[PDB]
Nucleic acid binder design. Structure first.
Ligand SMILES: [Mg+2]
Ligand SMILES: [Mg+2]
Lengths: 87, 91
DNA sequence: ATAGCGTCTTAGCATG
DNA sequence: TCATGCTAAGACGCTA
């Protein structure tokens, strides 16, 4: 139960990159976060809301053509480096 | 890249250009978009930096009338003027 | 979606 | 040389 130094942008990024189809709906993004980080079981209930806000307004996440989310090809490398610059 | 005006200068020029010297945050977006077309297709984070500058800077006071109106604190105004006449351009 | 305030990094300058 | 502090600035994120 560590504290993840990554933002919710990097947690969503790693969950989608670990999927077989490189895409996930908002449900499995929750389940991937709880598994690899049991920290969010003791966190306040609003943690699921903050990842939807990031999923919706971040330039790095788009929907494919309960829909499915994926990584945007333009700002993809912005996320790989955002995970190398995390404190 | 970014226009040569700082976010504090962009907010100051938008409020002073209004008849009541008071604006909500949505109207500040509309003034900057029409006077600077770069932000129409810019990354969406620029609106976040606008609201961040309003809450952080002491020279921007919150006033009441759904958000709230924003104005320029009078006792911090001519300090902001001299800072903007000393460095009028900041890319 | 919006509005308020936040975290993080960077930079020049500055003091120990 | 170094560390530490100050100040403004902004890209980007969180919460209600
Ligand atoms: Mg999005
Ligand atoms: Mg203020």
């Amino acid at each position: 139960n560590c504290k993840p130094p990554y933002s919710f942008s990097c947690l969503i990024f790693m969950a989608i990159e670990d999927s077989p189809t490189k895409r996930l709906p908002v449900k499995d993004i929750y389940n991937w976060i709880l598994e690899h980080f049991p920290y969010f079981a003791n966190a306040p209930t609003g943690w699921k809301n903050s990842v939807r806000h990031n999923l919706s307004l971040n330039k790095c996440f788009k929907k494919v053509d309960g829909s499915l989310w994926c990584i945007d090809p333009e700002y993809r490398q912005n996320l790989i480096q955002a995970l190398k610059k995390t404190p």
